[PDB]
Amino acid sequence: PAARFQVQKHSWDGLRSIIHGSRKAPHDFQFVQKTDESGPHSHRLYYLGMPYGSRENSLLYSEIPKKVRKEALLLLSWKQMLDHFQATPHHGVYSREEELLRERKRLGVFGITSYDFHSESGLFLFQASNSLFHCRDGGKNGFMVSPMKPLEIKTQCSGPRMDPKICPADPAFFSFINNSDLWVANIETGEERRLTFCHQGLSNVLDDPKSAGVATFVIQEEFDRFTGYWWCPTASWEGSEGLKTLRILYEEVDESEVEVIHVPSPALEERKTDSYRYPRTGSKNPKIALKLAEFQTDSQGKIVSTQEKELVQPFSSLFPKVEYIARAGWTRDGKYAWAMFLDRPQQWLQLVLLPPALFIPSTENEEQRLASARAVPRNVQPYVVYEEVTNVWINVHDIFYPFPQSEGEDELCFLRANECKTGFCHLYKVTAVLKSQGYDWSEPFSPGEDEFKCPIKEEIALTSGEWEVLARHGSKIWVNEETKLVYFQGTKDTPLEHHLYVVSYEAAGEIVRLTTPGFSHSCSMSQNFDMFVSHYSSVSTPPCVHVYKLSGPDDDPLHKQPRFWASMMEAASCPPDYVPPEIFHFHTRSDVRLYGMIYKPHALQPGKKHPTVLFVYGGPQVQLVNNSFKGIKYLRLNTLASLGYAVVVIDGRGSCQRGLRFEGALKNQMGQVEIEDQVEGLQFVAEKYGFIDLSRVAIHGWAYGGFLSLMGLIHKPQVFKVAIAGAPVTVWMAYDTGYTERYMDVPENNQHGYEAGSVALHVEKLPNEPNRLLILHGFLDENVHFFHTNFLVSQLIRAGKPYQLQIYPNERHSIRCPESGEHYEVTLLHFLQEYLHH
Amino acid sequence: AARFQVQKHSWDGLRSIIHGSRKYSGLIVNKAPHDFQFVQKTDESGPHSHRLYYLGMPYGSRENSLLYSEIPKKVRKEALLLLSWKQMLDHFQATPHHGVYSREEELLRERKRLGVFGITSYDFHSESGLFLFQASNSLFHCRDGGKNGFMVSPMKPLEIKTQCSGPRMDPKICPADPAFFSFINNSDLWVANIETGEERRLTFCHQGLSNVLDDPKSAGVATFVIQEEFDRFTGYWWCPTASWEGSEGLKTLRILYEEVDESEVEVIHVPSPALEERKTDSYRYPRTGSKNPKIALKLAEFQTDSQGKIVSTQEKELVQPFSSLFPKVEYIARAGWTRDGKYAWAMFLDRPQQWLQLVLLPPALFIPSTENEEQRLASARAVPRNVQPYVVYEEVTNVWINVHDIFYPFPQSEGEDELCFLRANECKTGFCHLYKVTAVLKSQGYDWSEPFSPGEDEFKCPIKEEIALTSGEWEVLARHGSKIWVNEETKLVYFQGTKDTPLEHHLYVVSYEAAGEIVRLTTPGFSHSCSMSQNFDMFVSHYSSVSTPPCVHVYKLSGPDDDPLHKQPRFWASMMEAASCPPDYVPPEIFHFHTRSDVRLYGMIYKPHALQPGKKHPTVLFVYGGPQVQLVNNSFKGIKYLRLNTLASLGYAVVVIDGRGSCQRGLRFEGALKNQMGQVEIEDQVEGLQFVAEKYGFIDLSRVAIHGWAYGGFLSLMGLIHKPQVFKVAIAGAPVTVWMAYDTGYTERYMDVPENNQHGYEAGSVALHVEKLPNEPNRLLILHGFLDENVHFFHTNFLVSQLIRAGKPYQLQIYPNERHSIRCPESGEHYEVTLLHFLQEYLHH
Ligand SMILES: N[C@H]1CCCN([P@@](N)(=O)NS(=O)(=O)O)C1=O
Ligand SMILES: N[C@H]1CCCN([P@@](N)(=O)NS(=O)(=O)O)C1=O
């Protein structure tokens, strides 16, 4: 039979030398057309980027030429917008507000990480150096040819100005959040005005529990929403004085009843915590309402008045089953505000139109409030234009595109991504009928079943089949109303690649792929539908960023050619010591297709079985196995393979980009099906490849992966010789409402699932042998609290079980510091060297 | 010579060894009765001379209760009387539900090192026979002796009803009138009438604001550093006498209290023991070099009528601010009253803790607190010219002041301008000794309405006489419960000391009239903890040796009344017989040697069990090595240090050395570590280890582990840093890793402020020397209680941060539910199993 390969033993400092030795793209695109026929450029393309000489992200541009040589590859020059400007604060130490927002968004890079852009005026608005800055380019002032100094926006406000946005109707104005309230300011005059008065500014913060315009913890962490306010895109002219009204839809929250937890602050020497309103599963979420903030401006841009407006009947009366606002915004004409509402079980979503006339001025005067309520026209109401229901869960999809209405039309046509209908996320063209029932809004009423529900006149599937339109985590559609085409991203070719597609929403038929097969693409489309960018890679090829021109006859828009135009970034040379993993698939005993990757031992010899690391995440919303470059994020897996470890990765049931039924397998039973699929995958790899030593398998993962590493050691102790569990969830009753309830229900409704899935309650089944269990955790983790590890250790002590522990005192949910990253990898190599070998 | 190899066990094998060692220890923890009060019986016919009251956990109970035993007038000389433990309280549970105390009571128990459940203290008023104590999240009382007579069976204790919100802490009976008691509620001083139920708030420092950090004043409360570093758990003191000033038949009662303002004190967060709530408690933690609380002594007065109704109250403050009168005072160590109530007194320390003043404060120096400037000026002008503070004693040193509790003022004659007192003083000779001091109290007059700036030696009293009652190169014990008993009829002072040997505490008596012969009252070959009857006819000794578990014996002082100094201690009865020395337990052997500098150091050795000649054994150097502790003495170590016997039973040699810095050897000996903590301690540990190896011949110097907790964890790391060829492995429990993160009271005493001793702080902070820790794995195990509010988990967290930056390996264990010490048996067992496993795998080659 096969010989058993022995990894070379190194000293601790030898392992440090291996790790240190081993560690020896433009984004956020805005296309602007140039309208000078004499000049050689069709567009200026703006973006964020860190070029190789820079140590932070800054605002950059490249010039797109009208003509390119067919025989040559143009590499576009990256031009600086800002002149020798440091956007990063001193020592990369952000305010707590900016630091936590960077954690919620998974932003690791320093400098400008987002900007707001107003195309007509050419205004850029962004956070930098613990303040707000702006610059102008294009519009009236024209296009810069060397970097300019950005202008700081002065304030009399105390503490950070968060979530800055330009007023779409009038770019003289921008909005921001300060001390949990919504403000506006005139960028030209410097005038600032507070719009909302939720935050009293009391000495005891726990007595001051309301905010306006703020996405709370669970909304940011579990619903991917980082804003609590939405500019109305249009101005209005109500009243006799001729003042211009500007409007902001905002979420008001009351966190009074939300549980408070303390997490250590990153300034360790101060030995203090930050307080979080952390809704643990089964406990109270914030009380929420949508409100309308208005202010009026004169011809000189002076802010003459402000008004808080609220729903004529309470949010809780109109929409009694709503737990969460997933998303909100406006129709392009500003005729309707809209909101995406979820029930607490997250099995029922409503898309609701809210006309501004349904909101009345807030007042303590009961007679004035009654007068305002009585004056609301009878034909004004909410319209539930769409409803999604499932026995699995609603994934929040960002795709909702309302078409403009004609005058006197009692219908709304819109594009909607819908997963629950077929179990795969697809594009539908929906026509809802908006008919007024007639309501006396001064008279309180409890709405009945389907009270505001709109009849659906038409619902056309634009896409169908066992593949997904991508509608989450930055994915969007682009709609050309001139050509009646919708551009979208999807897995139609393969679940291993993201591609750009186009289909008609008028005459739904042929879907045209616009991206190159054999790569996974992240695309940005011009609002003029003339050009697009793709950031793309493969398992073998590092990322490149290419600009494409949509070319061909204007009478055949569906079959426009994606013509390669220029490169923004050529693929880096694949290092000689880097060997890409190999993708495979197999069918389980239940005949489900699973995909996996194998990092083959480097310089592999036949007839030899190698010690193996099963690298696991295995949780919802993640797919580890796809045809994209893994060497930037997962270099440590190549390093393991270079020492002669085989590394196996399996996307089991519960993982994403395979439809709702596939991820639905773990419903109310997290931990159970995932480990079965991991073991089937490992055993398939051993049978297919023949270089896996099944007597020497380590299971290793972080967060959900740490949870499954422990589940593996508990339930399959003959399969897994050692577990290395990073930031593990050890008790589901300690995780939050938004995530845990979606997949597991509330604890009272799923006692068996919570008990079976909580590894800290099964410590009696963990090994009675030392050196089979290494626990790792960031001390400052505000997501999977250090509590999870602390509670697991308390249980290990009670059960008389041995454990090894490493803490990252300066790290939250991920290891960001390179020295801590290296120490983690050295520790992993040492643990495997000493304890995976017999 | 052959190398002994310890038998390798499985993890579950080690669990069975540790579980067996503790379950079948042959000893009981928290067994001894304590807090003794002797009361004479007044029945000449009856068979008992005294009732003896105490706290004790009787066999067939899981908590401390209030107990008594009857002391017979006659005992048989040839028989051993075992006193029957009688319950005072009828089937009463004093422990709260699931042994979960309020945060206030829990932290007080941590400061006091109280592990036992139930009644942990009582206040007793002997004349009235009133007992006052905390139990079951409330206040209870009972009565026995005096007028009510002596109970023959247990009685139900009476709860004291309140309309206060939150705990009533630090309850005390009014000495002048036992109808009244005091307590602290929400950081303010209250009094109550126990007979009528009437309650009255005296101080109004605590506003009760929603934001606690905007509410930084307390009255009657000892703050964190005072409790943790000065062994003071109260911030108020009853005046022992009533007065009758004013214009009605009203009686005035008085309480001296410390008012503190913690506004400028740094706030830190420590995790709460309810881990599932994921919250912290806020502490006003003065780190070394940062602000201590602003402090003042004030006087609370109230008047009572003939019905015991509280008619009126007054807050009074010093006529000139505390900060003006006493500008160099950082800390109030101690306070109280003269027995006649004529003076309040305070023990003041400067911030360097090198200057102590004993200061008398007459009540007339305190005036009513007021916002009305005209009323305040009138009050200040009315203070008599001859009223002033008196500095009756001053202690100065170039080492540090240890706070000694022994101050006994003799009551003054009317019109006497002198005060006589007994005082324990260490700084005079470098050894703690008893002095009879006479100070002259004369005033040359002050205008208290005029703004005040004290000169050098303002208020300083001439010393007429200072008699040394004790002398030599040994100590009177004056700290951590040690006290004197003064019989004014016989002119004798009873005290404890190290006169016979630094290895044993003994009870002594000497005359304070004609200072001469010191008589020892306790048996040599044991260390004694004694309680004396207030009638000086009987005493209790709680005593043990290295070889004999503790017993508690009652002794009668007998002989001719005309020769009180030579009264003979006669064994009378047993409160608790010594358990048999367990067959599996082998006592350690005490030795001494002289260093190369000719300092005598004491040590102990646990020999490997069933030792064979010509065999070198792996060795554990068990270390504390910090100030205020002596590990090596002739007392039983098997209750607290059973794990050292367990190590010896597997064939480890265990060595303990009391190096320079350790206590019970005088100020010069402990003063060696001044401004250089870490440096001399390791030199003495290594000399001790090397002496033991040369003398005993069974030490394998190639296989030595260093292990300690707290200061011992600090020294374990210092050993591995500075002597990496001596120490193969270090196991550091709850280590201090950065002195700049420890508190004012302790750190500044031994090290000065960071700004004045940058080199000492740098050299003594092991977290700043991680580059010198081993680059090899399995040489360093760190252990820490997650909830430690003393040596914060931060010390370990910061050490780990530095280890990561330096690219060093480490092993780590946390005790999620433990503070500064491991109290839970499951955690204690897990710690010992982990230690055995670490030594088994990594001390062997
Ligand atoms: N709240 C969840 C959302 C799904 C992904 N994750 P993580 N653990 O994968 N984030 S990450 O920053 O580790 O990628 C979560 O924590
Ligand atoms: N603040 C000091 C006072 C002196 C003794 N100690 P420890 N470390 O000996 N505590 S103990 O509870 O272990 O006895 C201190 O922490």
Numbering used by the authors:
A (entry chain B): 20 to 43, 52 to 865
B (entry chain A): 21 to 865
Quote the paper.
The dipeptidyl peptidases (DPP) 8 and 9 are serine proteases of the dipeptidyl peptidase 4 activity/structure homologues (DASH) subfamily which cleave post-proline bonds two residues from the N-terminus of a substrate. While DPP4 and FAP are extracellular or secreted proteases, DPP8 and DPP9 are located intracellularly to the cytoplasm and nucleus. There, they play important roles in diverse biological processes such as pyroptosis or ubiquitin-mediated proteolysis, turning them into promising targets for chemical probe and anti-inflammatory or anticancer drug discovery. Here, we show the exploration of the natural product Sulphostin, a DPP4 inhibitor, as a starting point for DPP8/9 inhibitor development.
Sulphostin adopts a substrate-like binding mode, occupying both the S2 and S1 sub-sites with the aminopiperidine-2-one moiety, and with the amino group of the (S)-3-aminopiperidine-2-one forming a hydrogen-bonded ion pair to the glutamates E248 and E249 of the EE-helix. Of note, E248 and E249 line the end of the substrate binding tunnel and typically bind the N-terminus of substrate proteins. After forming a non-covalent enzyme-inhibitor complex, the active site serine attacks the phosphotriamide moiety, most probably via a SN2(P) mechanism.
